[PDB]
Automatic annotation (TrEMBL):
<feature type="binding site">
    <location>
        <position position="13"/>
    </location>
    <ligand>
        <name>Fe(2+)</name>
    </ligand>
</feature>
<dbReference type="GO" id="GO:0042048">
    <property type="term" value="P:olfactory behavior"/>
</dbReference>
<feature type="binding site">
    <location>
        <position position="28"/>
    </location>
    <ligand>
        <name>Fe(2+)</name>
    </ligand>
</feature>
<feature type="disulfide bond">
    <location>
        <begin position="45"/>
        <end position="102"/>
    </location>
</feature>
<comment type="similarity">
    <text>Belongs to the PBP/GOBP family.</text>
</comment>
<feature type="disulfide bond">
    <location>
        <begin position="91"/>
        <end position="111"/>
    </location>
</feature>
<feature type="disulfide bond">
    <location>
        <begin position="16"/>
        <end position="49"/>
    </location>
</feature>
<feature type="binding site">
    <location>
        <position position="24"/>
    </location>
    <ligand>
        <name>Fe(2+)</name>
    </ligand>
</feature>
<dbReference type="GO" id="GO:0035275">
    <property type="term" value="F:dibutyl phthalate binding"/>
</dbReference>
<dbReference type="GO" id="GO:0046872">
    <property type="term" value="F:metal ion binding"/>
</dbReference>
<keyword id="KW-0964">Secreted</keyword>
<feature type="binding site">
    <location>
        <position position="40"/>
    </location>
    <ligand>
        <name>Mg(2+)</name>
    </ligand>
</feature>
<feature type="binding site">
    <location>
        <position position="26"/>
    </location>
    <ligand>
        <name>Mg(2+)</name>
    </ligand>
</feature>
<protein>
    <submittedName>
        <fullName>AGAP010489-PA</fullName>
    </submittedName>
</protein>
<keyword id="KW-0479">Metal-binding</keyword>
<dbReference type="GO" id="GO:0007608">
    <property type="term" value="P:sensory perception of smell"/>
</dbReference>
<keyword id="KW-0732">Signal</keyword>
Length: 123
C-alpha cells in the first residue's frame, strides 16, 4: 500500500537526514520530486546516503541498474512500475558524468525527478 511505501521512505529519511546539515524545505521537497538545481553537498550526500541504504549504490560508489530495477519491482505499486523503469533507463548514464558519488546519486535522482515529476518520489 502507499502507507507501507511512505513509511519505508520515512524510515530511510530518518536514518540519513540527521547525518547532514540539510535545509528542511529542501529535504521535504524531494519527496514530491522537487529537486533543487544546484544544492550544497549536504543535500547531495544525503541522496547518496539514501542510495546506499536502498543498497543501489555500490561500495565503489556506482549506482547499480539491476539493483534499482529490483527495488522498483519490490516497492512500487503495479500501476507505477512502468514509468519508474522508463525513468531509470532514461537516467542510467547520468552518473558517468560525475566523479563525486554524492553528485552521482543526487543528479541521477534529479534526472528521474525531471523526467517524471508527476510520479517520482524520493525518501
Ligand atoms: C539516488 C540515486 C539513485 C538511486 N537509486 C536508488 C536510490 C537512489 C538514490
Amino acid at each position: 500500500t502507499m502507507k507501507q511505501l511512505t513509511n519505508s521512505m520515512d524510515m530511510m529519511r530518518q536514518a540519513c537526514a540527521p547525518k547532514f546539515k540539510v535545509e528542511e524545505a529542501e529535504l521535504h521537497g524531494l519527496r514530491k520530486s522537487i529537486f533543487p538545481a544546484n544544492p550544497d553537498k549536504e543535500l547531495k550526500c544525503y541522496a547518496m546516503c539514501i542510495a546506499q541504504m536502498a543498497g543501489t549504490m555500490t561500495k565503489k560508489g556506482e549506482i547499480s541498474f539491476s539493483k534499482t530495477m529490483a527495488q522498483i519491482e519490490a516497492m512500487l505499486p503495479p500501476e507505477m512500475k512502468t514509468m519508474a523503469k522508463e525513468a531509470l533507463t532514461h537516467c542510467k548514464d547520468t552518473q558517468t558524468s560525475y566523479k563525486d558519488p554524492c553528485d552521482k546519486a543526487y543528479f541521477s535522482a534529479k534526472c528521474a525527478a525531471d523526467f517524471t515529476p508527476d510520479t517520482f518520489m524520493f525518501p
